[PDB]
Design a protein around this ligand. Structure first.
Ligand SMILES: O=C(O)C1CCCC1
Ligand SMILES: O=C(O)C1CCCC1
Lengths: 276, 279, 274, 279
């Protein structure tokens, strides 16, 4: 539905990523998106502007334009935003919070002081929506209609994986797929360094490592097999791969990724307990 | 709209790599499965049973593969290659392009073996990986002494149908083995561990596996489609004070980057050993 | 015709006065600095510089329009008690002390005269060679010309930009303490040069030149520091081998640890003040 | 500045170093971009597009660069140097000053190759770094057997226009490689990490990169302009009980200093290996 009007409160990386993805998917026209920022001097705002997205310094204007309204500002700004534009949330609005940690309860508490049944959806998505390969989960609020969940899923499915979850899973999702791309970019940078150390040109090492990661991830998604089984299938006895896997194990490679997911999840919980 | 009507492909070996390439080529539409033949000394393999269902011609005799094939993939373990080349060396004809996929095995050693039977064998050395099974492989190749200009181009067209493919100098292939050859196993290990992390924080295992794999897929795709440095893309994910930068700190504190450097180095060095102790 | 004063005549006051006068934005004789111990080395160097000196904080307040507070943070309250009754309409109070909040300064000064004009800044010692890194936050009653004047004064001795006050403790961890990280790194790099056979004097020069040149490349490039690192390291080469050993020691994480530890200690100290 | 009046400069190799030096030299006003020639086997590189846009003459034939040049910089990987010396060695004339920038490659090895062509090749070995592109390089050079006295003076004046430059005995050069040759990469790693630290504590990435870069620049300039020991300047920054000494403790607990010593040693040792891998 290109007839949908979409707003973003916040014109940062995620607003840009989602707007880019939605327009590339054909589901929205760029000029049917409006975004607001208190800082119009950002680079993301210039890219949004170049895309044809409407830009304004007035959050109220984004709200009035919008049918689906994404909250795409830092968690600690969300209560101030709700104070500011709570009076302007209408019954027709679906309010979609993308802020890490921020609970449906806290949003509904603010918005309920104005109209009684604000339709609220909480989502955790990630920057690969920009190439329509995002990972998105969402939870529906108290007054979100069944059609609202399905509309949400349809829209976010256009830019990658999307599924409904209970809200108590979202902080963990944040630690896994929300922060996940950054772990991968770190990994890809390091793998390229290892390629370069062993004699590959940087450009080729970056390409090969990224292609290797894309292909393996795709294999797993399209396989009913355990990742341990796919790992077994790669490594011939006495061979190069199993030697590399040993040195990963000796440094506690697996545990570092578990540490990461946990640290991001826990911090996400602190961002909310800091608020409440 | 690529298709090789004249080309008969054979695999010496019917294991994981031969399966992956034949599945990729057939899914790409570039080869009919019935125009592919694979040989193996063990017809009781699951990969062998899977190639059957695809329609691949199977035989226990490597000489049959060679007689049926124009493009000949050596998909056996490196230490088996010399015995293979001794076995079928007298069956190599002018028409054959021998594509070795064995890790570490040099063009020099293959040409020396085959040249004892017939001069000017056309040899191509290849490092590819298992994601060719989903047409997202990463493949490099190096052309031998007697490989014609059309030979490498033909191999690039074919291997491009199942993922990234480019020509390299042969002395890069051991390093590519360490990076993209072994790379999928690094990723499978990472995805298992990330799923463990998701489970620890309360996600169901199936969802954690799906989300972690989607995250890696999307990130890798972002980088392939971006002109930006992976550090710059990393910067765009992490909000100041946020969850991501906290998690990045704990990766750094464990030397995460150095473990991946360590791995590429270890695989490449083992690959060089596999050769150096062959010859 | 601007009069600048310094409460405290230690390392930071000398650094700023030296930078300001080397910059040509202030005459040394228009600068006054007060100290409870006129026998510090920093006092002699300010004297030799042409700065006016005194042991009366009240004389400095009376002398100047722009008043820098360059004492240790636990002294700021006792300085504000001592001179709060002498702050005039004309005064801009610029606190350089780590952690001390605009709120707490305005509260002490407001007991004597309403609407004190207060600026909080975080700078560092390289202002002495006019390559400092300075941020500042404007107080409740700072006029708009106060901040712009502040940025003009401090841009003459390095980078200067306005920040929200809640960023300043982090800046302290990064560019406030940063020169000490860099001096530690330079000492160690020189040790590495000496171990590999270089004379100490040459190793210190080359290591310092390397860090300066790389810093300037980054400041002047639109590119990411990762991308500039890629450009240094040829495949299989010496640099990528050295980067591996830094990575195996968690080099990056130690620098993150440092910025965090300094920021957290800055927050800790202010909460002890509260 | 009579050295540079009508002096022509050539680059064998058009990679990062050739661009940085060419950009540095032009920005200093010592050479017009049109008086600089560069050769590269692959003109498909980015630096070759950047250089071409500078008004710099490119060519794929190193013999063209040799013919067009007085001072000839060898800016190719160390394993290529003896291959280049064989290619253009008969074209090296008495007028040429051959300035090798390849890490590890010894004056002796270059002179031995070129001495078979003409008896007294003028050879200078150089270790510089990428900040010559903003005229803040760190350069050392050693003069060869047949370099005339003006050659070393000419070399010093040229490289002084893009940063620090001093003559050294050649046996120090591998160590300088480990320190200031590789050093900017250490700084870029450090700056990326400091910026991550700033982001973790709530700073926007852009501001954190700028603040971290300015802190390093200011501290380096401070040390260069001070007669004081680095530890004394460190002491001046740290207030008792304060934030800086707390941060320095955590650096010390991770062996921060030993990592930098490790780095200089590792690069120096790798440089020595790249020399001995040649001869
Ligand atoms: O706080 C953060 O870093 C966002 C939540 C997951 C992705 C970014
Ligand atoms: O081998 C290398 O990496 C070159 C020598 C110093 C910087 C690059």
């Amino acid at each position: 539905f290109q007839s949908m009007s979409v707003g973003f409160i916040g014109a940062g990386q995620l607003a840009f990523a989602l707007a880019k993805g939605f327009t590339a998917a054909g589901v929205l026209a760029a000029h049917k998106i409006m975004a607001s920022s208190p800082d119009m001097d950002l680079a993301t705002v210039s890219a949004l502007r170049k895309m044809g997205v409407k830009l304004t310094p007035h959050n109220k204007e984004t709200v009035q334009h919008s049918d689906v309204l994404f909250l795409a500002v830092k968690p600690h700004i969300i209560p101030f935003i709700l104070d500011e534009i709570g009076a302007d949330i209408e019954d027709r609005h679906i309010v979609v919070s993308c802020a890490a940690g921020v609970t449906i309860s806290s949003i509904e508490k603010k918005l309920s002081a104005f109209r009684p049944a604000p339709r609220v959806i909480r989502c955790m998505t990630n920057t690969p929506v920009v190439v329509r390969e995002g990972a998105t989960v969402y939870a529906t609020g108290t007054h979100a209609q069944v059609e609202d969940g399905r509309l949400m899923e349809q829209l976010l499915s256009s830019v990658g994986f999307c599924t409904e979850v209970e809200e108590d899973l979202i902080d963990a999702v944040t630690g896994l797929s929300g922060s996940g791309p950054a772990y991968a970019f770190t990994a890809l940078d390091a793998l390229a360094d290892g390629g370069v150390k062993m004699g590959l040109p940087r450009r080729l090492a970056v390409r090969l490592g990224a292609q290797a990661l894309l292909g393996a991830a795709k294999m797993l998604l399209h396989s009913e097999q355990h990742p341990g089984q796919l790992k077994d299938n790669v490594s011939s006895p006495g061979g190069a791969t199993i030697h590399a896997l040993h040195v990963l194990e000796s440094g506690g490679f697996r545990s570092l990724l578990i540490n990461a997911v946990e640290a991001s999840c826990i911090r996400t919980r602190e961002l909310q307990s800091m608020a409440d």
